[PDB]
C-alpha cells in the first residue's frame, strides 16, 4: 500500500518535528518573565461612540494617519469615520450586504471590502468627481472572503473560505500568487511590518506562515484545539497571537517554531473573535463572545483589564498605528473608541 506508506512516513516526519521543537523548549516564557513588574489594572474609558451603522459591524480597519477608520456592516455600508470629530467622511453603499471584511490602504486613497459574494471590491476614495466609486473587483476566489489587507496601492492579499489565500494585482485584477495548504476555512490574515511575510489562521486549528514573493508555506503552527478566528502579528514581526474557539489565546514564536504562552481562564468559556497588540506589544487585547474585550499581559499571561461597554458580540477590534486609542466594533451596531 503506497497510501499508508505515505501516511506512516508523514507520522515519522511529524515526530521528528515534534522532538526538534521539544529540544529547543529549554525554558518557559513564564520562567523568563517571572520577575518583571506587572502592568497593573488597565482602566480604559469609552471616549467616542460611532452610531451610524444599522446592522452588526463585522469588521473595521484604521487608517495609517491614526485618525480615519473604515467600518464594514452587514446592512451594506462602508462608513469612513473621522474618529477625532466623530464625523462621517464617506458612506459607501455596497452591492452585497454580506461584507465580512474591510481594509484601508496605507496611502489612504482606497478601501476594500468582501464577504459571501466571494469578491474583493476596491473603492477609489480620491476620485476627481469627489464621490467614491468602485474601481476594481477581484473574482478569483471560490469561497467567502474572510480577510483582506493592502500591501500597497496595487497589491492586496485576501484570505477566503475555500482554504486558500491569494495575492492580487489590482490594476490588472488577476491573481499573481495563490497560497494553498490549509484544510479549513482561512478566517484571518496578518501582514508583517516588512510585508515580506504574512500569517493566516484557518478552521483546521492551525496557523501557517507564508512567503509573499515565493508563495510557499514556511512554517506551520499547531497547539490550538478548535478553529482559529483571529490572528495578529507582534510589533517586531518575530511572533504572533491567535484567538480560537477553544476560549484560548496563544502566542507563537517564528524562530522557535512553537507556542510560547497561553491566555486562558476557567471562567472564560467563549471563543475569541479578535486580537490586537499595543504599540509596544506588552498588552494583548482580545474580543470575546461574552460581549466584552479582555486586556492580557502578553508577558505575564495575566488578565489586566476588561472593556465591557458593548451590548453584543465583539466582532472586531483594532489599535491605531500611533497607539493612542483602541476601536472595537460589535454586533450591537456600534463602534466605540477606548483610551
Amino acid at each position: 500500500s503506497e497510501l499508508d506508506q505515505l501516511r506512516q512516513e508523514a507520522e515519522q516526519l511529524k515526530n521528528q518535528i515534534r522532538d526538534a521543537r521539544k529540544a529547543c523548549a529549554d525554558a518557559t516564557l513564564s520562567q523568563i518573565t517571572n520577575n518583571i513588574d506587572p502592568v497593573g489594572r488597565i482602566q480604559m474609558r469609552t471616549r467616542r461612540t460611532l452610531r451610524g451603522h444599522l446592522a452588526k459591524i463585522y469588521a473595521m480597519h484604521w487608517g495609517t494617519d491614526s485618525r480615519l477608520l473604515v467600518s464594514a456592516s452587514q446592512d451594506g455600508k462602508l462608513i469612513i469615520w473621522d474618529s477625532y470629530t466623530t464625523n462621517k467622511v464617506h458612506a459607501i453603499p455596497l452591492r452585497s450586504s454580506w461584507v465580512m471584511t474591510c481594509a484601508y490602504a496605507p496611502s489612504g486613497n482606497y478601501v476594500a471590502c468582501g464577504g459571501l459574494d466571494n469578491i474583493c471590491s476596491i473603492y477609489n476614495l480620491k476620485t476627481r468627481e469627489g464621490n467614491v466609486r468602485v474601481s476594481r473587483e477581484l473574482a478569483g476566489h471560490t469561497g467567502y472572503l474572510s480577510c483582506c489587507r493592502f500591501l500597497d496601492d496595487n497589491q492586496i492579499v485576501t484570505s477566503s473560505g475555500d482554504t486558500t489565500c491569494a495575492l492580487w494585482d489590482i490594476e490588472t485584477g488577476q491573481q499573481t500568487t495563490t497560497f494553498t495548504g490549509h484544510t479549513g476555512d482561512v478566517m484571518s490574515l496578518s501582514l508583517a511590518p516588512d510585508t515580506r511575510l504574512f500569517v493566516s489562521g484557518a478552521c483546521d486549528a492551525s496557523a501557517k506562515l507564508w512567503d509573499v514573493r515565493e508563495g510557499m508555506c514556511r512554517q506551520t503552527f499547531t497547539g490550538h484545539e478548535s478553529d482559529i478566528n483571529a490572528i495578529c502579528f507582534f510589533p517586531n514581526g518575530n511572533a504572533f497571537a491567535t484567538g480560537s474557539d477553544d476560549a484560548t489565546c496563544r502566542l507563537f514564536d517564528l524562530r522557535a517554531d512553537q507556542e510560547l504562552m497561553t491566555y486562558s481562564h476557567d471562567n472564560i468559556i467563549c471563543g475569541i473573535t479578535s486580537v490586537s497588540f499595543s504599540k509596544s506589544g506588552r498588552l494583548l487585547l482580545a474580543g470575546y463572545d461574552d460581549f466584552n474585550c479582555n486586556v492580557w499581559d502578553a508577558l505575564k499571561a495575566d488578565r489586566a483589564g476588561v472593556l465591557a461597554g458593548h451590548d453584543n458580540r465583539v466582532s472586531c477590534l483594532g489599535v491605531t498605528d500611533d497607539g493612542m486609542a483602541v476601536a472595537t466594533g460589535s454586533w450591537d451596531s456600534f463602534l466605540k473608541i477606548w483610551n
Binding site: 452588526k56 463585522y58 452587514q74 465580512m100 469561497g143 467567502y144 473560505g161 479549513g184 476555512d185 478553529d227
Partner: peptide, 20 residues
C-alpha cells in the same frame, strides 16, 4: 431571500452571518 451558492459544505463559520 438569500441562497448560498459556491460555498463549501463547512457551514459553521458563514452561518453566523444570518443570525439577524
Amino acid at each position: 431571500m438569500f441562497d448560498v451558492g459556491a460555498q463549501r459544505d463547512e457551514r459553521r463559520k458563514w452561518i453566523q452571518c444570518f443570525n439577524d
